């Protein structure tokens, strides 16, 4: 899982901040 308001960017391999 990622921290809140972060998603798993498979391309990057890291939890990225996302909005939606």
């Amino acid at each position, epitope marked *: *899982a990622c921290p809140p308001s972060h998603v*798993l960017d498979m391309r990057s391999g*890291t*939890c990225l901040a996302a909005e939606g």
Partner: antibody
Amino acid sequence: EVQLVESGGGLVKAGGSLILSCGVSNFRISAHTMNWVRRVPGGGLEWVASISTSSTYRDYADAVKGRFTVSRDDLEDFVYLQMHKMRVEDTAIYYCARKGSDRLSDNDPFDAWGPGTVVTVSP
Amino acid sequence: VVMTQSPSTLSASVGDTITITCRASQSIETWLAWYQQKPGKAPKLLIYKASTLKTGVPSRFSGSGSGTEFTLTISGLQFDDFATYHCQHYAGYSATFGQGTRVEIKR
């Protein structure tokens, strides 16, 4: 070279508690995400828990979520794993491992593991 | 994300070139490592990012694949190479392993 060493294992009765620590040699933990992994009697490995750098986020496996706690000590280079309300299937060899590699990057594997500490939960 | 390693037991002979496969439930890019573990010891890192051979590790080891399917290849088994091999997916702050493959001398 890069070494880890876990201590704290033993025999625990079911429902009981046990805490593991993990110290290191030849590097600083503050640069890495630290992980707890366990090898069950079946033969396979299971990812247990992790802390991000400076404790920003802690992640747990579903099977241990709510029962285990992972902590880190950047100043004295130690990692902790609190295990509560222990189940029989918690019986395994427990390793601490660091997320890293030869050439550090954004997303790294587990390049260094401690030798492991045995944890057995009595039915 | 679920990992499925195959086979559970691989029976082989010294000198053989053998292959272990690992299939991810969903696309995983190339984020996968392979590990070797001898009974009572720690897992050793062999290959990461699908195909990057860790320094020090013998060149007879090699991995490939991308997306949902990955394969470990050992070209010319040595006695030392009989052990258990694990596939791992690593992303974010978590990870997930395969069941493991045990490699044994065939008779």
